[PDB]
RNA sequence: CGGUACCUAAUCAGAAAGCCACGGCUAACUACGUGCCAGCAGCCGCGGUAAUACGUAGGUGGCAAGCGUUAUCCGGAAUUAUUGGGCGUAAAGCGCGCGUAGGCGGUUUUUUAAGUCUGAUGUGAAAGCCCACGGCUCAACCGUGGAGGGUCAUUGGAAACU
RNA sequence: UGCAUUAGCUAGUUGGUAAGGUAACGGCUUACCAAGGCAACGAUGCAUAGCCGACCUGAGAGGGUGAUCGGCCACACUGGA
């Protein structure tokens, strides 16, 4: 009764329901364990020009019944 | 023991101890290959692997079988100065053919390996297995009588510590595992394993 | 109070006029087996004589090992130049735990509880250096805990 | 697929079988309804039933099925025919 | 250079104690001086004397050593830099060298110390190998 | 070498050179392919024995062998033993070794495989063969 | 699969043992045809009218169903390095310097509990986390239960770093 | 997936809206969207791939381990409706 609700950062613009995510996280090593920054993204295009381009947002982009944005959106939060 | 019997061969056997020996009329050195010469058990190209015979055939099994017995030594992984030695030196080659157990210890493994030994229990035909408490290594009750079976009232009873016997067909006890009380000390707990370890 | 043991020999034969001698330059450990393993060297000549003519020079100075008996409780090692060894302490109820050339000097000081991580260079004369490095730089436990202002076990 | 599997096991003649009824689509070696115990039901002692006796409510009410020998030993255990009493309950 | 005083100043001090120089200076600090306060309380030295200035001032040092001219400063080290630190928790921490080691101390849940948390199951922090 | 800027390459040990191309070679004859499957069973053909007009001083009067097994691929090997039937068109098998007083030569040819002779001049080294293994 | 096992004991001192060499290191003895020839020949050899050694030998050596090798990994040798490599000569240190991201550059205070031996448990892959086992001619090799762990999940919030 | 003596990669492209369809859901095709998106995170491309344990084993660090042997994919004269 819950699904993916991560946080990210928007990139590009067009019709139909932004948020074009770019999440930042950590990845590490075996013998010395250097947990250090890396990222992962999910592209889409602008809501109605509600999603301000360059917006460090709580991300996702709603369930797809057409073809530009991937999956379960939560809410637009913060501009960046 | 040493691949030898001191009735004829007390010579290459550092210890065989079956008979009178051959230092009297014979030279007691050796007939071959197991005198005190340059055999490599030392600083590892030295002069004691003839006494590796004193180490190996003492407890019966040959190498790659005595090699089985030494990893069995490493099995009891407590004090590997003593907990390896106690079970490495916990067999019976003294219940076997000639001299006193009944008359069964010396010319060792001729006859007691009957295949019909009929221990207290079902059957254990091979004393290589350290005998169990209550499981008495008896002989075939139906073919029992020998010069090696009921001669313990006169020649010698009492195989090593916590390993006792009876007289009626020589029923062992092995009530407890044998410590170093009546077990041997010829296999060095330190040097004989330093041939293996360091 | 030192330790008795033979270390090695060496037949020196120099480029000289006549026949090259083969003086058996020998190093020996001498004493009566306390824990303070004292070795020394010597340049001596005759086949049966050079053992004692070299132990003559060995005992001129034979070194002390202030030995924390039973076992040096922590990791015990040392180093000089290209020479060093290591000893991880293990249980004393294990028999003899040693390396290749350090086996009989492991028996010299009575610990017989640590292992012998046989490290160091490949140099034979300084093989002695690598050996003795491990146990020449020692200091006892209670005396250090006293020296550090606190008690013997306030610091534990 | 689906009958009480008397499943092959062991070294040279050590057929230490296991109580099982394999899946309706899996083989004797494959996945199963559920593994219910560790005993050879052809043991020289007896059928010798040691199972998850509390699991009679799930696999009997969904999918499982004995075969001609253990439906007896299950209901002198109080499982198989006794699940018919449970269904009547 | 002095993430630790044992980093660069030890270049001076390791000889200064060979020559019995039993007093020196240090940058002004509160955790750095705290850990030396632990060590002087253990009896490494006389005492961590205090700061003359406010900001990176001279905390005075007063280094006693062994009565036998011995030194049990068996190396102490750290890697602090913007780019190298512990963005990471001693809600559990173990010890090394059977408790003889005593060295650097840094975390955030509730005040104990390196050796004062050996038993807590919310431990401390140890770097050095003393014996 | 660093550690934090070592993430672009770890501080580790080193790598291997070429070793025995023939011990572990194969051949796929489907599409002019060239295979490897790590088997001692790889073959050749019996060709040659000889030397050439010296420059270096290596003194030895012993048999050279450009001599090999069934299917032709050119190598440089050894024919052990004095009694030998290795002139041309032979098939053999091969193992490794070097006996002293032999310059640089480092392989062998097993005795009695398909088309060679046997061992004659050694009678005190008697009881070999280890598998069909009586006394 | 078994008129075989169990058994009478029928059976008798019966019906069941080779290696490189006899070479310094290979411990297997010195010898001869052996005169750096044959050729055994592993670090290295020997051999030239005094071969121990080529060839041969009665014993003969290290262990025995025993005898030596072949491809793989490692002992050997951390002679492969956080742990457990250095770089002048030796395994390696740049005509050079000048430079952005960076690695690392000095910090002095302070808040979170996110990680810095989870609390305790359901909790754990075999030839592989502790013991019990049974059979193993011992073995050859098989399996069994607990410990189910003391190993993940699940619950925690809080220093003197962040 | 690994790999530049493989680098600049890609073009309804970059996968929402409307029509269609998956028990589910989509550029899956279409009327619109920016040349964008992908980047030496060596994408592209080359090589390769059924996958794990498996064993051996370096002091611990822990790991290479598929033949078998077990588990988990794909194919059953090739291919195509």
mmCIF file of N, CA, C and O in Angstrom, chain A residues 10-20 44-51 60-61 69 73 76:
data_model
loop_
_atom_site.group_PDB
_atom_site.id
_atom_site.type_symbol
_atom_site.label_atom_id
_atom_site.label_comp_id
_atom_site.label_asym_id
_atom_site.label_seq_id
_atom_site.Cartn_x
_atom_site.Cartn_y
_atom_site.Cartn_z
ATOM 1 N N UNK A 10 14.671 18.633 -11.641
ATOM 2 C CA UNK A 10 14.060 18.635 -12.969
ATOM 3 C C UNK A 10 15.022 19.247 -13.986
ATOM 4 O O UNK A 10 15.952 19.978 -13.633
ATOM 5 N N UNK A 11 14.789 18.940 -15.270
ATOM 6 C CA UNK A 11 15.744 19.222 -16.345
ATOM 7 C C UNK A 11 15.118 19.921 -17.554
ATOM 8 O O UNK A 11 15.562 21.006 -17.942
ATOM 9 N N UNK A 12 14.101 19.303 -18.168
ATOM 10 C CA UNK A 12 13.629 19.679 -19.502
ATOM 11 C C UNK A 12 12.145 20.018 -19.468
ATOM 12 O O UNK A 12 11.452 19.746 -18.483
ATOM 13 N N UNK A 13 11.652 20.599 -20.573
ATOM 14 C CA UNK A 13 10.313 21.176 -20.606
ATOM 15 C C UNK A 13 9.604 20.977 -21.940
ATOM 16 O O UNK A 13 10.206 21.049 -23.015
ATOM 17 N N UNK A 14 8.302 20.722 -21.818
ATOM 18 C CA UNK A 14 7.345 20.453 -22.887
ATOM 19 C C UNK A 14 5.990 20.283 -22.193
ATOM 20 O O UNK A 14 5.855 20.629 -21.019
ATOM 21 N N UNK A 15 5.000 19.752 -22.901
ATOM 22 C CA UNK A 15 3.702 19.547 -22.265
ATOM 23 C C UNK A 15 3.786 18.475 -21.167
ATOM 24 O O UNK A 15 4.860 17.999 -20.802
ATOM 25 N N UNK A 16 2.629 18.182 -20.566
ATOM 26 C CA UNK A 16 2.316 16.868 -19.989
ATOM 27 C C UNK A 16 3.260 16.452 -18.849
ATOM 28 O O UNK A 16 4.141 15.602 -18.994
ATOM 29 N N UNK A 17 3.041 17.093 -17.701
ATOM 30 C CA UNK A 17 3.323 16.488 -16.393
ATOM 31 C C UNK A 17 4.785 16.190 -16.040
ATOM 32 O O UNK A 17 5.197 15.030 -15.988
ATOM 33 N N UNK A 18 5.576 17.235 -15.805
ATOM 34 C CA UNK A 18 6.917 17.084 -15.248
ATOM 35 C C UNK A 18 6.951 16.404 -13.895
ATOM 36 O O UNK A 18 6.075 16.594 -13.047
ATOM 37 N N UNK A 19 7.988 15.604 -13.722
ATOM 38 C CA UNK A 19 9.166 16.084 -13.010
ATOM 39 C C UNK A 19 10.294 15.148 -13.401
ATOM 40 O O UNK A 19 10.187 13.927 -13.260
ATOM 41 N N UNK A 20 11.385 15.724 -13.895
ATOM 42 C CA UNK A 20 12.361 15.001 -14.709
ATOM 43 C C UNK A 20 13.569 14.776 -13.820
ATOM 44 O O UNK A 20 14.545 15.520 -13.859
ATOM 45 N N UNK A 44 11.279 13.405 -18.277
ATOM 46 C CA UNK A 44 9.898 13.712 -18.643
ATOM 47 C C UNK A 44 9.883 15.181 -19.072
ATOM 48 O O UNK A 44 10.943 15.753 -19.354
ATOM 49 N N UNK A 45 8.696 15.791 -19.149
ATOM 50 C CA UNK A 45 8.623 17.186 -19.570
ATOM 51 C C UNK A 45 7.510 17.942 -18.842
ATOM 52 O O UNK A 45 6.652 17.355 -18.179
ATOM 53 N N UNK A 46 7.548 19.269 -19.013
ATOM 54 C CA UNK A 46 6.964 20.237 -18.080
ATOM 55 C C UNK A 46 5.489 19.990 -17.781
ATOM 56 O O UNK A 46 4.734 19.499 -18.621
ATOM 57 N N UNK A 47 5.089 20.335 -16.552
ATOM 58 C CA UNK A 47 3.734 20.065 -16.083
ATOM 59 C C UNK A 47 2.727 20.889 -16.863
ATOM 60 O O UNK A 47 1.997 20.374 -17.717
ATOM 61 N N UNK A 48 2.710 22.184 -16.572
ATOM 62 C CA UNK A 48 2.016 23.183 -17.364
ATOM 63 C C UNK A 48 2.863 24.445 -17.357
ATOM 64 O O UNK A 48 2.349 25.565 -17.437
ATOM 65 N N UNK A 49 4.180 24.258 -17.267
ATOM 66 C CA UNK A 49 5.106 25.250 -16.726
ATOM 67 C C UNK A 49 4.729 25.591 -15.287
ATOM 68 O O UNK A 49 4.725 26.750 -14.867
ATOM 69 N N UNK A 50 4.397 24.543 -14.530
ATOM 70 C CA UNK A 50 4.342 24.599 -13.074
ATOM 71 C C UNK A 50 5.683 24.176 -12.489
ATOM 72 O O UNK A 50 6.263 24.884 -11.660
ATOM 73 N N UNK A 51 6.188 23.024 -12.923
ATOM 74 C CA UNK A 51 7.523 22.605 -12.532
ATOM 75 C C UNK A 51 8.536 23.591 -13.084
ATOM 76 O O UNK A 51 8.789 23.632 -14.292
ATOM 77 N N UNK A 60 8.446 12.235 -8.618
ATOM 78 C CA UNK A 60 8.230 11.175 -9.592
ATOM 79 C C UNK A 60 7.156 11.721 -10.524
ATOM 80 O O UNK A 60 6.589 12.783 -10.263
ATOM 81 N N UNK A 61 6.845 10.990 -11.589
ATOM 82 C CA UNK A 61 6.048 11.557 -12.676
ATOM 83 C C UNK A 61 5.041 10.517 -13.155
ATOM 84 O O UNK A 61 5.430 9.446 -13.630
ATOM 85 N N UNK A 69 6.413 10.455 -19.465
ATOM 86 C CA UNK A 69 6.825 10.431 -18.058
ATOM 87 C C UNK A 69 6.507 9.100 -17.370
ATOM 88 O O UNK A 69 5.446 8.511 -17.583
ATOM 89 N N UNK A 73 4.226 9.673 -9.267
ATOM 90 C CA UNK A 73 4.447 11.019 -8.740
ATOM 91 C C UNK A 73 3.942 11.173 -7.316
ATOM 92 O O UNK A 73 3.024 10.474 -6.879
ATOM 93 N N UNK A 76 5.379 18.303 -6.051
ATOM 94 C CA UNK A 76 6.464 19.238 -6.353
ATOM 95 C C UNK A 76 6.724 20.104 -5.127
ATOM 96 O O UNK A 76 5.784 20.621 -4.513
#
